[PDB]
Amino acid sequence: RVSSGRDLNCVPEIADTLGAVAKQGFDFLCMPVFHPRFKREFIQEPAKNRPGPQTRSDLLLSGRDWNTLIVGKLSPWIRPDSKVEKIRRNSEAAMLQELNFGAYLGLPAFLLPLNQEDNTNLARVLTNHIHTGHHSSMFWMRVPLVAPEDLRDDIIENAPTSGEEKTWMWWHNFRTLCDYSKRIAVALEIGADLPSNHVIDRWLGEPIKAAILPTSIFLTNKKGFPVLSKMHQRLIFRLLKLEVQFIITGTNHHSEKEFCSYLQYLEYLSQNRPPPNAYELFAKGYEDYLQSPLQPLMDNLESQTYEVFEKDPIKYSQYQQAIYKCLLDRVPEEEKDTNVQVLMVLGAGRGPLVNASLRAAKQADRRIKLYAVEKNPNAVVTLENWQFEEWGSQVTVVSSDMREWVAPEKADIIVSELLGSFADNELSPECLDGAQHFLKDDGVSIPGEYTSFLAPISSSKLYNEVRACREKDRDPEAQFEMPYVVRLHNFHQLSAPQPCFTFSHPNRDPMIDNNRYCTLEFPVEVNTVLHGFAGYFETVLYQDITLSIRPETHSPGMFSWFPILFPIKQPITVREGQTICVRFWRCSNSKKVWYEWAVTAPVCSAIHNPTGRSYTIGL
Amino acid sequence: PPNAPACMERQLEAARYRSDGALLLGASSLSGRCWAGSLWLFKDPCAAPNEGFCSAGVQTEAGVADLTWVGERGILVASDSGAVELWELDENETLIVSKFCKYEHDDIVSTVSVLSSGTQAVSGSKDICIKVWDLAQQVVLSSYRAHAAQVTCVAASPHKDSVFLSCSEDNRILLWDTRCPKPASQIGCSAPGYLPTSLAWHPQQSEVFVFGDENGTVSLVDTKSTSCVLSSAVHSQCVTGLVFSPHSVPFLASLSEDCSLAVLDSSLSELFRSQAHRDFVRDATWSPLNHSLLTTVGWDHQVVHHVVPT
Ligand SMILES: Cc1cc2cc(C(=O)N(Cc3ccc(C(F)(F)F)cn3)CC(C)C)ccc2nc1N
Ligand SMILES: CSC[C@H]1O[C@@H](n2cnc3c(N)ncnc32)[C@H](O)[C@@H]1O
DSSP states (O other): OOOEEEEOSOOSOHHHHHHHHHHTTOSEEEOOSSOTTOOOOSSSTTGGGOOSOSSOOGGGSOHHHHHHTEEEEOOTTOOTTOSSHHHHHHHHHHHHHHHHHHHHTTOSEEEEEOOSSOOHHHHHHHHHHHTSSOOOOEEEEEEESSOSGGGSOSOBSSSOOOGGGHHHHHHHHHHHHTTSOTTEEEEEEOOSSOOOHHHHHHHHTSOEEEEEEEGGGOEEOSSOOEEOOHHHHHHHHHHHHHTOEEEEESOOSOTTSOTTHHHHHHHHHHTTSOOOOHHHHHTTTOBTOOBOOOOTTTSOOOHHHHHHHHTOHHHHHHHHHHHHHHHHHHSOSTTTTTOEEEEEEESOTTSHHHHHHHHHHHHHTOEEEEEEEOOOHHHHHHHHHHIIIIIGGGEEEEOSOTTTOOOSSOEEEEEOOOOBTTBSTTOHHHHHHHGGGGEEEEEEEESOEEEEEEEEEEOHHHHHHHHTTOOTTSOTTGGGGSOEEOBOOSOEEOSOOEEEEEEESSOOOSSOOOOEEEEEEEEOOSOEEEEEEEEEEEEEEETTEEEEOSGGGOOTTOOSOOOEEEEEEEEEEEOTTOEEEEEEEEEEOSSEEEEEEEEEESSOOOOBSGGGSSOOEEO | OTTOOSSOOSEEEEEEEOTTSOEEEEEEOOSSSOOOEEEEEESSGGGTTOGGGOSEEEEOSSOEEEEEEETTTEEEEEETTSEEEEEEEOTTSSOEEEEEEEEOOSSOOOEEEEOTTSSEEEEEETTTEEEEEETTTTEEEEEEOOOSSOEEEEEEOSSOTTEEEEEETTSOEEEEETTSSSOBEEESOSSOOSOEEEEEEOSSOTTEEEEEETTSEEEEEESSSSSEEEEEEOOSSOEEEEEEOSSSSOOEEEEETTSOEEEEOTTOOEEEEEOOOSSOEEEEEEOSSSTTEEEEEETTSOEEEEEOOO
């Protein structure tokens, strides 16, 4: 299903227009609150004292209709950035008059045009209206994909036809003056002559709430029904992934067919999109939703937290397959009945790896002895109920910390799922290092290696959400110095993911040191604004068996982990050809472990989270 | 009168005199429950805008932004609905019947002008498009997108069937000639001034025209030249229209949003001024019967008959 609206600049009577628009299938209506040609004077008499009402009464619709069906439109004669002072003073008062009347009707959105480069005074008036009272209405900025001058036909003979990205700089410089207001979104206007994919890819990271589609860009098939080019369809398809509201403007040029045929073609493409990836279908409702990263070592996870871990069959089948191949390599065929392996699930949780180790033992036709070490006593109750009713004396539930547990015997294999979005962000190195002593000298660790990957991203939405995570009684910028687990959606990857930290288990190093310093340089072949760094990870369970949330090597179907996000305090502008240089540290003391990061090129940022002042991981 | 609106909307938008003396009126409602327009014929000009004393009348679907005569009985209308409407008077000249209503512009049709050939007319609109119409076949012959802003005003050449001026908020004044492969040619002051607002060819010299800007300055420009011949600061606000008197040596009637009317000579020197209006002055027309009368309408619902000292 598609949410759509009808843009109109002429409404004789609201009752009849809203009904005809509703009959054609539109959900809302874009219309001017004052008459477009009703220019008003606020200073100079006698035009100042114009009698009569300035517009029509609010009683023409219900409050429920205004709140959900009518989208306001600024009058086209209002030019706050004019060069004549008299035109500015009236445009200021007229914009405030229409914006206040828009909030008077409780309109959910308001349309304002970004049809030129300098909208500074326009930004100030809107900012003053935003900082007047507390409201939540949206302001849709009308900005075209390609500028009107860059879309004119070469009909003039004495004036023939980064410069092709000029409309984005209109928006970027506007929202920056308004300090990234949450009430200001983009109403992206599409032209017949689409621009470069660079400009298109750049708008994708912006809060595009509406997509305006004129009727002049629609093609005509043999039957006469309005369609689109193979480029416009590729644009509409990627707009549907952002789940935007499409707006139809302009009169009916396919007058042979009904005007609602434009709308039926959009629902046609929407139901013809590629089948939703099971990752998209499952993680629906978590797009760009920031979550605090889990700390299963410092905290005890709730039951429904473990329940989301176990809803992924692909994740544990890979674990079963890794243990299955490791069993066949350690015990030969002639020793399949005399050699019993000592498996130790370090961090058994509610026993999904214990069940997987049992299925890997039956599949390999080998004998095993299981120790289920879990520190969470609330989860040990589940393990011991499992151990008594089903597993039997084969599994030995150990309610202790693996770093402290004195094992009665050494282990042939140790299996752990102590990995987060950034691989080692749950202190899996420190846990397996403490548990490393009761592993045999030829013992195998599953996983035996994991690696975290970083990618610079651009998302003015995600930056605006982190910016909204400010809390009382703490550092006002502390929200920018902590990572968030989040399914990244409305963002733009600025460079290919590069590896960051890497750990190997068992750690044969005599001087074990899990502190890391990694410097990464990212070629950025586009102009953009850096907002944060995405964090993925790859891990090697055993030999070819691997897991990964890294996009290019993502394990198909595995939806257990979301990517992690390291933000930066101030967004950094990056030009084409420049290289983003970020540096990450993994610091630790006896009690806490934390990450510190800083950008050093093109410009330098501040060192984020020093001494773990804003974010620490508990040992 | 029959098929006649009981009352006409307050904002009088246009006033055009016919050759015989009848006054064509165009009003539109810019406030209130209903936003529409109407068309009126006043064979008696001194009875306007009283609706009970009108010769003919009809109300349109939307508002009347600009109108012009098409001969002696046709009325071309630029509607807010994005349509260029043509209305014709019946043989009785008591009813106004719609000829065609073609929705070809995607926004408000802001200006319209009939070419000298009588069978064609150009229309400018806020959709950034100028269209050359064929009044006979009721079809758009050409659609030009040469401007980058909303087209402010288009004006046809007096005796050239293919020449017409245009200006938009992109600070461009385009001289058109559909006989050329690239018909538009940007003219005016090479240095970008304030935005043009109104255009008016000279009724005698086929190369001379005047234009007023948003700052209140009326300029005298020759097309063969490429720089201002003469200019004068006439109004304190945006100049809405410019109309020339039907004299041999013609006067220039300027009207603006400062609720004032001015009549200048060939040197743009003021010879007459009238603050008779209390709101915006929208149109001005000279009487073909008495060349010293000047009928002006405005948004204050006044139809003032100005005696011009000539
Ligand atoms: C074993 C393990 C798993 C981890 C998972 C995650 C992780 O991504 N979320 C966010 C999330 C993931 C999936 C879904 C949905 F809806 F798709 F199922 C929703 N929300 C935490 C959540 C599972 C409680 C973070 C750290 C983890 N650490 C671990 N050791
Ligand atoms: C299945 S998610 C990680 C599990 O491992 C457990 N765990 C984490 N760290 C340790 C540790 N040092 N010793 C024992 N269990 C642990 C946690 O309690 C959680 O149930």
